[PDB]
From Swiss-Prot, chain A:
The N-terminal HD domain has ssDNase activity. The C-terminal GGDEF domain has the cOA synthesis activity. The gene is csm1. Residues 451-598 form the GGDEF domain. The keyword Mitochondrion does not apply. This is CRISPR system single-strand-specific deoxyribonuclease Cas10/Csm1 (subtype III-A). Its EC number is 3.1.-.-, 2.7.7.-. Changing D15N: Loss of ssDNase activity. It comes from Thermococcus onnurineus (strain NA1).
Curated annotation (Swiss-Prot), chain B:
Belongs to the CRISPR-associated Csm4 family. One of its GO terms (biological process) is defense response to virus. Probably part of the Csm effector complex, that includes Cas10, Csm2, Csm3, Csm4, Csm5 and mature crRNA. Interacts with Cas10 (csm1). It comes from the Archaea. Signal peptide: none annotated. CRISPR (clustered regularly interspaced short palindromic repeat) is an adaptive immune system that provides protection against mobile genetic elements (viruses, transposable elements and conjugative plasmids). CRISPR clusters contain spacers, sequences complementary to antecedent mobile elements, and target invading nucleic acids. CRISPR clusters are transcribed and processed into CRISPR RNA (crRNA). InterPro entries: Csm4 (IPR005510). This is CRISPR system Cms protein Csm4. One of its GO terms (molecular function) is RNA binding.
Amino acid sequence: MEIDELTALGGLLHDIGKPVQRAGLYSGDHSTQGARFLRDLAENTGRAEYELLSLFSENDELMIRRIKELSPERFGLTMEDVLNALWIVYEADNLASPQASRPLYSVFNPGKAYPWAELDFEKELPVPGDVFSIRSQDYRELVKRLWEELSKAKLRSDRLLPVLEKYLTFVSSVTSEGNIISLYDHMRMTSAIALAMLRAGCTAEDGRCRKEKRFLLIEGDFSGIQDFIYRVSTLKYLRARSAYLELIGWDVVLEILSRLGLTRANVVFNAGGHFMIIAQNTPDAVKELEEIRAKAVEWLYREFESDLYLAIEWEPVSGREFGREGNLFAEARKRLKHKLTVRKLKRFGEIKGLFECNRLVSLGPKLLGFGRTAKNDAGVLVEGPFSGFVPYLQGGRPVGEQILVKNTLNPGEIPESAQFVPYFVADYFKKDPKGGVATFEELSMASTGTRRLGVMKGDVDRLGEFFSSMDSPSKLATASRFMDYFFKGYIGAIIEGKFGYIIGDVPSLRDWPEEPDIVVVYAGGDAFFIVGAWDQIFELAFRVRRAFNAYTGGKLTLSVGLGYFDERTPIYRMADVVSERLDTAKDEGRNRVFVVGRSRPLDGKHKLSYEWNHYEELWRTYAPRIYAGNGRLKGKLESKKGLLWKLLEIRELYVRDPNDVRWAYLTLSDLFPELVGIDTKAVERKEPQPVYWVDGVLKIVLMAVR
Amino acid sequence: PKFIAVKLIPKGPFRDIPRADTLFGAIGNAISAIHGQSAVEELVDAFVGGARISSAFPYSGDTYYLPKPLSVEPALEGDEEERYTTAKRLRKAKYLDLKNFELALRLRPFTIPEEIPYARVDVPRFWEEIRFREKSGVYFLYSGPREVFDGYIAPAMRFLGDLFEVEFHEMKIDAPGSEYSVTLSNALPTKTPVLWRLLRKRMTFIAEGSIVKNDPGGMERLELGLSHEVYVYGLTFPLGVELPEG
């Protein structure tokens, strides 16, 4: 072992006492009980390193003697070193910062709490419901699986994080009321902060690291992503562009960790082109950041000629600022944000000489991950600023100092020396008759009624605020991950048709298929871009928004723009139009979907957008009376398909002038009793007539019947 | 300072809002057709001499719009929900009315134009045009000697008229005396600028609204092989701008 690996593993295992206390066992307090778990484990298999790492959960009299008994020379460590490793990790626990059965209360809604289960994308949607005690059995089952994994684990932080993430993700780090922080997140943010303090060179400090700017907050944000992906020259290709952006971002992050000698625990978050890292504030570091930032931008400039820029900034921050005094952390993030905004108005300033497509076709099914190697290496299919990426297939061998493995937390059969970097991505796609991904043409052909491609852009409303209200690194970590994982993790499931009970009864035109005609372009961070058969995409929007309502405490809200285009429309226009429709739903207040393009009066009283609940209710009311399902109108309206069309031309003589009462004059008459009468509360509330809203249902029905 | 605003009244739609390089281009080609290359040389000299034209901007009746100076983008912070929402909308806005432009230059509070006098239609088959609102067109500023306006800019603009028709009025922009200035024209910078948006055309231009500190921009003449050495306009149209510290 070495001092750096120890301190990382030291912060990462400090609070592994908590789950063993909760399951019973050593009958001690979590501190003492954690020591007895690792010491007992160490003796089993016979890996003494754990007995060294057991000292973390516990006048320095006994401590020095207990350390001395354990040979520090055996692991090539100094006695004086290990005292630092303990004190450092001790303070690290305080900076990232009571019955036993208390569960993890949602970051999205502290009122509701998560029922114990291990992180599994396949095994159901995390829905924060009613507060239930977790049994002293569920924890016993946890600790035994946990013990079994740690036995076979290789004892590097990259092989320890994935098993801590599997099992301790849905566990309250402290068992108090309305505790929001996942244990995994507190553990990695103590490993993160601890290692920083070591690399910062501060030692025997009981506040030189605490009340001094010995840390760096490193936030990295790509800009012009929309142009890089959706504005060039096919779906196969446009998918690979989104995948290339993921690898490029990783190539930068991993490089930053590599050159600052930090671990993946130091990656506070990395979602949707936005990443944050905590690090040391050594002159050696800021130099290595200035070197990296430059060599990245130069490469991004050479490669894409200003379409894609990477804005990296860092701020000197102290232990004080990771916590609250009377919320410093948010205010340290704000001063870093402002730094970034400024840098984005200086795109490619890191180039003084500024003022003087076959590899993505062969990259656009069968692979498990990618090998981060040198550029000059055989088999390298794509290259980022710092490293080539060698595709890693099922039957093949992984190649490179780091291996990126897709949609698992289990290394699998990879070499013991290789660093395990897990990455999740939403990449659901309707398979063709051929093994390849469906085309805009194949998708549009599949749709009920009209043959149009369906496009939906979807963002989360006022995320900036939600994240700004996080006290501590560990909180922000639990916030980011749970957010990212909804889109990266569960959108796949949602498309498959899972969680019917959670999201039942949403507007739909056909029965939901086994192999839906959908292709995810992106699904990560707080946003998603998905295309498919227009009627299936229309329904998915309501499914996704319902799942997200449940996945949050009904406390966060989506806005969605929908689009139904001729298959032969260019990618760039469809994007521009759904984009225009999305930020229109947000502008018209938030928590609302743009369902279909609409004529309206330009009197500043009439919103193109519908509130999710408004539309969901409108559909429940009208659709069952007129629509039978799977492309077929109601038998009553066969030979009357026009009575619908006549209401559209009726609503138009309300759009012409919403003060003209002619639409009363014009109005079986039993069908649609809501519209015929002149609404009055709407005239007082300064709101539209029911007539204004209906088209949103009818137009969609008429598209499904043609 | 006061300037000559060349107002373009459109006879139907416009392909684009022309920016300074393509305005000078159009005027350059117009002069060569009227007075030969000798006049083009006297025009480049006048411009190198200190004369400047802005990029084109929208006007609506008696309202002159100008580009949002990037100076404010950082300073926007200087109700949470209102703050986030307002900031984004101000960030998105590409133009400010003269009244409000003169404020933004001094880092005082200002408001956005609610409706902008044009809308990019895109007729498919596809390509798009620009539909101009009633009594709404495009204009651009000229600073320099009158004998250069009368001799070259004016005649050229009439010649280019024959899709639009031309009239020009005197215009005043109160602008704070400062070390820093906004460009009202896309520019090929000499020095590295303060704040900017890049613009790709191949050439690398700083966009309008971008902030420079004592940078006149430069012109470029290149041998395409078209038989006459063509000049690309990249001069800065500077108005002094107060900056926030950071």
